[PDB]
Design a protein around this ligand. Structure first.
Ligand code: FMN
Ligand code: SF4
Ligand code: SF4
Ligand code: SF4
Ligand code: FES
Ligand code: ZN
Lengths: 117, 123, 240, 692
């Protein structure tokens, strides 16, 4: 709500616009620059402007955690990232993930976690 | 030595305020190639206030120093010195550093130790 | 030194060099223990002369071949690390170093592994390539990275999931390992593949045409047109 | 003594018994390779440097085939080009498609040699495909992604040979060989961040600079490393306001391609807790302020306290420039008070050895000279911690030769093998008389290293008395052609501070100061500065030392300024400035030059060249950059450092303590970084680090 704009003056924005996204409250990087710091830094030009028609596009760190974990019988779990309705080469380059340690290992391109069983 | 700084069109402030450096580029510790380590680079030492600063707007690296991107390549050290004092510039020159030649044998790896072994090779 | 060439040393110092030098040919001298195994009638171990015919070796001291001389598909003199001699060559070949180097092969340890005509050569050399993949120490990169590729290609050629050109390819990937290694295990793992391609090309083409008309056609690497990578593993192809 | 052969028609002469790849490097012929390195042992793993040699049936490996006379070598044979394409294709068929996510994008040795020598296309297209290697957590400093390993043994050869940490190895046969600790054991050594410049592929890579930047973007700058005794050479990569990494450029004398852990990963603390504006204390609270406000507060507090003489203390610190010490010493001596001390405990007096005769406080044999040594002994030091590159030198020379070591001080865990002598000055003198008078008198090229931790001891002059009497009495340790008394200096400033004369007098150690100046000077305690005193802290980031101050003044750190630095050997070397000081920080000598104008002092210089002229007025071996001179005064200096503490100091029986408590957090930058902060806890004695 009320954040201090370098002068003791409180500025007041709605609580739905201090979130990084409507998926996630907090920041997902050590230099993500949380929204309260952003409105603190340049509120001179959020004047007379609608906050709702700003983009705010669904942070992806939370849309990948809710995907299920794939289970592989073998040793190596191989990955495309491709669709198979699409006529062509889409998705990421094929990488092969070792699933031996306890836990579920993620794809470094797509983040889909694979687990050996 | 002829003095060409008044006929190149360069300002006076570049020739009187800026010190420059001739250097041979070091061999990179990351990769084992040596191809960029032959030509003598000419490059300007930075200005304290004028180098770079973060934009208020986005975070763009904005500069006031304009020679920061220019960098020259020369064939020899003498050609770089001749050109640098021909254009009227104050230079510092940095001497290169090569590796010392030490004779290597593969058969060094397993020579007979009469006393304590004091090492275990592994290969 | 080998344990046999040391165990021969006292008697050859007693009997003399002139007695040992009489056996065999001019450069290949003396006698040798032969281990005759595989699919013969009676597997045995004898000690006989060098430079002797293979037919008189297999016929006179190990029963015969299980099924006769008609029933000879191939023979491997020496260990695993020797190319196969085919049927018409191995009739008049001698068991020294010269007459096998002349037929681009090795005497090796003079193990005689004959291969039955009702057995498959491709399954055999797939098993040899799996042996060299298991037994390589894994130090130098062409040997270690090579016999894994040779196994991945020989499993595929035993199933038959290939194009007609990929065995010319397999010849080239024998040649690239063959002489760039530390020891002679890369040299050893090259040779049986090379002997297979030199002597039994239509035997591989027959299996590949068999796979081409049992099920659908196949692209490079064994991929079929149904084959797609789903979650985790690959489906659509029967995974050799 | 030399052998002449032919490569590519070129005729070349090289010393006998060398490798063939050294003959190819001498003749200018470029030979590609993956498991050869100048500072490492020879292995024939990667099979890349095959080469056509007349009188050889097969292509022989050029790294391990020794040089013989009458040799005709060809590298442009069609067979050699075929061999390189073959071996390159073999390397690439289990190496994963990670080039957009690999950290070595424009830096990969495997990648630049695959254009130049490898095949165009790839035939690897099996359904079964590549192998996959489990990730192996080694430590907090090294990110480890071992799918993209090529098994070049180079990390293993190094941590075996030079680092002295035998925890790395290779466990397995076939493709199931791995390169890591077998048990998932954490790897310590004092230089573990050097294996990540060594791996040619990106399997061992940097953890704080994990995915931050990218080598075609980086601007490289050749500077000098502070927070090290030896003052190693670095390479600063900058995006332009930030500093990304330092990475060692080669110099065979000062560091020999290998650089400290603490020097490398302290770029994190360069940018995390900095001072960007002056702050004036109101009382229990700082406020930040104007420049005129801070500097006029300094002038008004000088006019209020009025220290007429011997009451303006000006103590410098661990990392400072020589030119800032010129500024500070000139300001205090034109003020009228040489209360001009250094930071260490027992820094208030003359440091028990001469500012006179530079060979008193310097490493007098060359750093290149330790390779020539026969039997050397150290007192009061741990060269594994302080100057960790000197430990690599000692272990390397001990491994190649017949070298004999003992130690006097705390029981140190060296990489190499020491003998123990004791924990007492009596144990020292007993060991000098009993066994090692004979050893050091017998030996050709011995030397003696003295830690500067015992210089900071109050019983210092007893040790210097005993060692000066021994070096003067023994003609082998000190003769014409080389010198054998040696000392180490912990900080990069102390050798420059002793060159310039930055030391107090005997009168200045008696009084209590009314106004104290901290230039750097972080390791001051609360009791060292008086409570009535008006202290001011000039320095680049906030610390212990900034918390005591009434005024703080931001300065440029070693990246942001061009500076002269003097090491233990005595080399003067310049750091080039990579970036500028952020916010409002200024250079360190300009601040003192401007504070002088508000006092009664006009310093005679005002530009950067006049600082160089004043610096040549102090001593002209500080405008003579990266040269080492001998000393004709080696005989006189040992006597003149013998006469002083003869009988003046009695040797007390206090045991010799360790100089630094931890390795990782010892100055103003390393204590601010979170990398050293989570490093010192993870490189504390745990089950993951116990050898067991
Ligand atoms: C992978 C490899 C495996 C080998 N195995 C044997 C063996 O099992 N028995 C043997 O006598 N020689 C073996 N050799 C050959 C040895 O190198 C042999 O001791 C040497 O080359 C010749 O010994 P010799 O003079 O007694 O014939 C092998 C060679 C290689 C490259
Ligand atoms: S040829 Fe032999 S030494 Fe070389 S990698 Fe293969 S098994 Fe190891
Ligand atoms: S190290 Fe390997 S995976 Fe990484 S960029 Fe280079 S070639 Fe690609
Ligand atoms: S861990 Fe790195 S340096 Fe060591 S063998 Fe593997 S790729 Fe080479
Ligand atoms: S570098 Fe000579 S073979 Fe690896
Ligand atoms: Zn993926």
């Amino acid at each position: 709500k009320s954040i201090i704009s370098y002068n003791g003056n409180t500025i007041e924005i709605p609580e739905e616009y201090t979130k990084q996204a409507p998926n996630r409250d907090s920041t997902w990087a050590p230099a993500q620059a949380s929204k309260t710091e952003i409105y603190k830094n340049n509120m001179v030009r959020f004047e007379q402007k609608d906050l709702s028609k700003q983009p705010m596009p669904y942070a992806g760190i939370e849309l990948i955690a809710q995907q299920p974990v794939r289970f592989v019988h073998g040793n190596t779990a191989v990955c495309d990232g491709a669709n198979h309705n699409g006529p062509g080469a889409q998705g990421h380059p094929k990488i092969f993930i070792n699933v031996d340690a306890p836990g579920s290992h993620a794809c470094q391109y797509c983040g889909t976690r694979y687990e050996k069983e | 030595v002829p003095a060409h700084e008044i006929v190149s069109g360069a300002p006076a402030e570049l020739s009187r305020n800026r010190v420059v450096r001739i250097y041979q580029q070091a061999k990179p510790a990351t990769q084992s190639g040596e191809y960029g380590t032959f030509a003598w680079r000419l490059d300007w030492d930075i200005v304290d206030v004028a180098n770079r600063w973060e934009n208020d707007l986005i975070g763009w690296q904005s500069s006031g120093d304009y020679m920061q991107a220019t960098q020259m390549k020369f064939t020899s050290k003498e050609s770089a010195i001749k050109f640098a004092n021909k254009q009227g510039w104050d230079f510092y020159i940095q001497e290169p550093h090569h590796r010392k030649f030490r004779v290597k044998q593969y058969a060094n790896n397993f020579v007979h130790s009469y006393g304590k072994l004091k090492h275990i090779r592994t290969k | 030194t080998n344990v046999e060439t040391v165990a021969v040393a006292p008697t050859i110092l007693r009997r003399g060099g002139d007695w040992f030098a009489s056996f065999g040919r001019e450069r290949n001298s003396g006698t040798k223990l032969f281990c005759i195994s595989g699919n013969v009638n009676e597997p045995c171990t004898v000690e006989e002369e060098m430079s002797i015919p293979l037919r008189e070796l297999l016929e006179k001291h190990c029963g015969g071949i299980k099924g006769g001389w008609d029933n000879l598909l191939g023979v491997i003199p020496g260990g695993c690390s020797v190319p196969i001699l085919p049927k018409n060559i191995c009739e008049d070949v001698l068991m020294d170093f010269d007459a096998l180097k002349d037929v681009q092969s090795g005497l090796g340890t003079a193990a005689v592994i004959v291969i039955n005509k009702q057995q498959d050569v491709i399954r055999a050399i797939q098993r040899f390539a799996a042996f060299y993949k298991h037994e390589s120490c894994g130090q130098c990169t062409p040997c270690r990275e090579g016999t894994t590729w040779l196994l991945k290609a020989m499993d595929r050629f035993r199933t038959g999931q290939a194009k007609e050109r990929e065995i010319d390819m397999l010849y080239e990937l024998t040649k690239d390992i063959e002489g760039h290694t530390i020891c002679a295990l890369g040299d050893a793992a090259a040779w049986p593949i090379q002997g297979l391609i030199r002597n039994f090309r239509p035997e591989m083409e027959t299996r590949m045409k068999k796979f081409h008309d049992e099920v659908g056609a196949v692209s490079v690497g064994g991929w079929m047109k149904d084959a797609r990578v789903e979650k985790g593993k690959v489906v659509g192809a029967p995974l050799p | 003594a030399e052998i002449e052969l032919t490569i590519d028609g070129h005729k070349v002469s090289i010393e006998a018994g060398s490798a063939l790849i050294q003959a190819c490097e001498k003749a200018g012929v470029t030979v590609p390779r993956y498991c050869y390195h100048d500072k490492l042992a020879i292995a024939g793993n990667c099979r890349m440097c095959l080469v056509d040699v007349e009188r050889a049936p097969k292509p022989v490996a050029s790294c391990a085939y020794p040089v013989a006379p009458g040799m005709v070598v060809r590298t442009d044979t069609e067979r050699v080009k075929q061999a390189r394409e073959n071996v390159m294709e073999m390397m690439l068929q289990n190496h994963p498609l990670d080039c957009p996510v690999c950290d070595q994008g424009g830096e990969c040795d495997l990648q630049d040699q695959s254009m130049r020598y490898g095949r165009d296309r790839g035939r690897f297209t099996e359904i079964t495909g590549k192998r996959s290697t489990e990730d192996k957590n080694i430590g907090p400093l090294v990110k480890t992604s071992m799918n993209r390993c090529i098994h070049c043994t180079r990390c293993v050869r190094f941590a075996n040979d030079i680092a002295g940490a035998p925890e790395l190895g290779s466990s397995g046969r076939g493709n199931d060989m791995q390169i890591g600790t077998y048990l998932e054991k954490n790897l310590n050594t004092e230089l573990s961040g050097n294996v990540i410049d060594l791996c040619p592929v990106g399997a061992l890579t940097n953890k704080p600079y994990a995915f931050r930047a990218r080598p075609w973007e980086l601007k490289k700058t050749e500077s000098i490393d502070v927070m090290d005794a030896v003052g190693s050479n670095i390479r600063i990569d900058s995006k332009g306001v930030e500093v990304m990494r330092v990475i060692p450029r080669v110099h065979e004398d000062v560091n020999e391609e290998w650089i400290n852990d603490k020097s490398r990963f302290a770029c994190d603390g360069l940018k995390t807790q900095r001072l960007t504006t002056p702050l004036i204390r109101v009382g229990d609270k700082f406020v930040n302020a104007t420049w005129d406000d801070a500097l006029s507060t300094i002038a008004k507090a000088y006019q209020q306290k009025a220290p007429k003489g011997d009451e303006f203390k000006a103590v410098a610190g661990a990392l400072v420039e020589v030119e800032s010490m010129v500024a500070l010493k000139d300001m205090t001596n034109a003020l009228g008070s040489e209360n001009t001390t250094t930071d260490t405990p027992n820094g208030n007096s003359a440091p028990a050895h001469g500012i006179t005769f530079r060979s008193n406080y310097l490493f007098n044999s060359s750093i290149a000279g330790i390779e020539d040594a026969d039997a050397i002994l150290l007192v009061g030091t741990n060269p594994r911690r302080e100057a960790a590159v000197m430990n690599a030198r000692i272990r390397k020379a001990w491994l190649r030769q017949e070298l004999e070591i003992a130690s006097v001080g705390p029981t140190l865990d060296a990489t190499f093998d020491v003998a123990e002598l004791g924990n007492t000055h009596a144990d020292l003198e007993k060991a000098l008389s009993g066994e090692f008078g004979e050893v050091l008198k017998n030996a050709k090229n011995p030397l003696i290293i003295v830690g500067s931790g015992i210089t900071d001891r109050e019983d210092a002059g007893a040790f210097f008395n005993t060692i000066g009497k021994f070096v003067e009495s023994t003609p082998s340790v000190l003769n014409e052609n080389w010198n054998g008394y040696n000392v180490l200096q912990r900080s990069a400033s102390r050798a420059g501070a002793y060159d310039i004369g930055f030391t107090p007098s005997d009168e200045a150690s008696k009084t209590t100061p009314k106004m104290v100046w901290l230039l750097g000077a972080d390791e001051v305690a609360a009791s060292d500065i008086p409570a009535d005193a008006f202290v001011v802290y000039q320095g680049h980031n906030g610390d212990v030392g900034a918390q005591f101050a009434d005024v703080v003044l931001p300065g440029a750190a070693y990246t942001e300024k061009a500076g002269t630095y003097v090491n233990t050997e005595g080399r003067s070397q310049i750091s080039r400035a990579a970036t500028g000081p952020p916010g409002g920080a200024r250079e360190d000598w300009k601040i003192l030059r401007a504070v002088s104008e508000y006092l009664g002092v006009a310093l005679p210089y005002e530009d950067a060249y006049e600082v160089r002229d004043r610096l040549a007025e102090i001593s002209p071996s500080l405008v003579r950059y990266d040269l080492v001179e001998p000393t004709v005064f080696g005989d006189v200096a040992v006597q003149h450092s013998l006469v002083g503490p003869n009988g003046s100091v009695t040797p007390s029986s206090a045991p010799l303590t360790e100089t630094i408590e931890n390795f990782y957090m010892t100055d103003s930058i390393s204590r601010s970084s979170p990398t050293m902060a989570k490093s010192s806890i993870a490189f504390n004695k745990d089950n993951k680090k116990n050898q067991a």
